[PDB]
């Protein structure tokens, strides 16, 4: 209950018996952090029959949004003020029988920037410790050609022409 | 069978062929050539004459910067995958990050302080 | 008691044969502590036959040896590591069995 | 209107991320190719500006009358274990063949 | 020519005795190896009673039967249950 974005809930038995019809039931298994008893799908299961009753009694109705037959099954949480009035609350996506909450485009980016820059800052502090300075010496860490080489290069090319490389 | 008597039976290890590498979609690989006559020269190759390039100093710094770069790259990849509708979405579920505390002020203060 | 110690140690060693649990422990930082390497060194008593007689899942022992190389624990923090090791394990297992079976059957059918 | 503006802000963010990534890459590559001769003034000369400019720019972009980012949500559509040569090109080599592991991981 | 032939013979001898030494190494492992057969049968039945020693007849890429104690067996497993 600390962070709903950082929780994943699963169950093996329901995994092989999973189909477009049963996705809501899997979310409904109860003891699932994402879904709640307050949702009306619960009040429907308690009562009897599931039909256009979500359009009659309007409120918290978890409904499947998009579905790929094998694994992908996205669920959306809506809050209805009246029939033909829908307000989307959140989205919980199930990949490989593993339920996650869809991250906000912005909470994800905030956490991401924080981790990267924290790494950069640790690296910087560590690099600061090793540099040592003196005005005479300059900087240090805490851890040419005699120009007679043109004739040597001429001799090298001469021996190249004389003794060819036979790689 | 009515009271089997177990005797000292010695068995030799069944190491006739080893599967060094196992590929996907079948395709077994028997890399082990079971040789020694050439293994002496193979070990002579290891012998000297005179973990990345050097990598004894600044290893921590190098790894830290690499990790930061990797996180940056992953975020960029996700953003480029949102840049289009290819295997992705962007539906704005009218929600509201409601913080039930005075977290902001305290956090700002402590952060600035440290 | 010593009985509970034996049972918990057996369960832990049999659980170590799981790459998911190994990646769990590696990410959570349990391997970096110098206490866990000594615990692993103590856990080598399972190599004896009298102790190996009670091991239901034998795939752990070999894995345990790798954990002593001190380079296996520095790596494996990645999830791709667990991916690859479980891939190779299940591949060896299933391919060995079913490939022996299929090779025998196919050769017997083709030679006729 | 708001969607057009949102897309514009998203593209600006993409640009910023790309620039930062490039900078970091060049920096670490240069460290590995220089090793010696590198001195504290130059190392500080590169870290400071590369990080300061990019980070300040990103925060500035995020807080200039841009769409509310907590509103929108990202939920995967199709996953196919098929080889893809276009996502490998588009993401510059990482994250190929959108499999099942990649959506919980990213 | 004699020297060359001698060197070839030496190489042959080397490979042969190296293989003989490998056989000797097997024999040294084998000596300590001798044990009760019934015990071998019981251990084989133990490791083979489940899906561990042999892949199941119908085991495709997607099975709860894993080479490890799954996660539900771990959830009831003494290990963390008693550590809690």
């Amino acid at each position: 209950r600390d962070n709903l974005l950082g929780i994943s809930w699963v169950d093996s038995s329901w995994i092989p018996i999973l189909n477009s019809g049963s996705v809501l039931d899997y979310f409904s298994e109860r003891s699932n952090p994402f879904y709640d008893r307050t949702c009306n799908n619960e009040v429907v299961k308690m009562q009897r029959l599931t039909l256009e009753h979500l359009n009659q009694m309007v409120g918290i109705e978890y409904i499947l949004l998009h579905a790929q037959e094998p694994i992908l099954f996205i669920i959306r949480k809506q809050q209805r003020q009246s029939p033909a009035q829908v307000i989307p609350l959140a989205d919980y996506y199930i990949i490989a029988g593993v339920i996650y909450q869809a991250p906000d485009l912005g909470s994800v980016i905030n956490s991401r920037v924080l981790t990267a820059v924290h790494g950069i800052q640790s690296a910087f502090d560590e690099a600061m410790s090793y540099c040592r300075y003196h005005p005479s010496k300059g900087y240090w860490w805490h851890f040419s050609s005699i120009f007679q080489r043109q004739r040597v290069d001429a001799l090298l090319l001469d021996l190249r022409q004389k003794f060819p490389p036979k790689f | 069978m009515s009271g089997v008597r177990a005797v000292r039976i010695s068995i030799e290890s069944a190491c006739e062929k080893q599967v060094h590498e196992v590929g996907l979609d079948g395709t077994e690989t028997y890399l082990p050539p079971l040789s020694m006559s050439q293994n002496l020269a193979r070990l002579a190759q290891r012998i000297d004459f005179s973990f990345q390039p050097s990598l004894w100093p600044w290893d921590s710094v190098r790894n830290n910067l690499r990790s930061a770069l990797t996180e940056m790259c992953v975020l960029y990849d996700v953003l480029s995958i949102v840049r289009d509708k290819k295997f992705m979405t962007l539906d704005p579920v009218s929600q509201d990050a409601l913080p039930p505390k005075q977290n902001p002020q305290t956090l700002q203060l402590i952060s600035k302080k440290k | 008691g010593n009985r509970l110690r034996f049972q918990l140690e057996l369960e832990f060693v049999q659980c170590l044969a799981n790459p998911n649990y190994l990646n769990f422990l590696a990410q959570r930082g349990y391997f970096k502590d110098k206490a866990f390497v000594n615990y692993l060194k103590y856990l080598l008593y399972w190599k004896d036959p009298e102790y190996a007689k009670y091991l239901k899942y034998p795939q752990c022992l070999h894995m345990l040896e790798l954990l002593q190389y001190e380079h296996f624990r520095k790596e494996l923090v990645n999830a791709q590591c667990a991916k690859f090791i479980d891939e190779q394990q299940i591949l060896h297992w299933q391919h060995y069995s079913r490939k022996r079976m299929r090779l025998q059957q196919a050769l017997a059918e083709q030679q006729q | 209107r708001e969607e057009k503006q949102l897309e514009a802000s998203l593209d600006a963010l993409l640009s910023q991320v790309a620039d930062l990534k490039n900078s970091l890459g060049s920096f670490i590559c240069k460290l590995e190719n220089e090793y010696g001769r590198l001195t504290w003034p130059s190392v500080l000369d590169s870290f400071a500006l590369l990080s300061g400019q990019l980070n300040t720019l990103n925060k500035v972009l995020k807080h200039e009358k841009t769409p509310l980012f907590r509103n929108q949500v990202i939920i995967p559509l199709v996953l196919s274990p098929d080889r893809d040569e276009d996502l490998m090109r588009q993401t510059e080599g990482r994250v190929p063949v959108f499999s099942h592991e990649v959506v919980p991981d990213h | 020519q004699l020297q060359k032939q001698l060197k070839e013979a030496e190489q042959i001898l080397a490979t042969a005795v190296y293989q003989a030494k490998e056989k000797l190494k097997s024999i040294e492992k084998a000596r300590k190896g001798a044990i009760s057969s019934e015990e071998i049968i019981k251990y084989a039945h133990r490791i083979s009673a489940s899906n561990a020693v042999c892949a199941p007849l119908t085991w495709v890429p997607g099975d709860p039967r894993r080479p490890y104690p799954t996660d539900l067996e771990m959830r009831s497993g003494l290990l963390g249950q008693m550590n809690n």
Partner: peptide, 10 residues
């Protein structure tokens, strides 16, 4: 189609 792949998809 595409069941989670313990061995890689063929």
């Amino acid at each position: 189609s595409y069941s989670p792949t313990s061995p890689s998809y063929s």
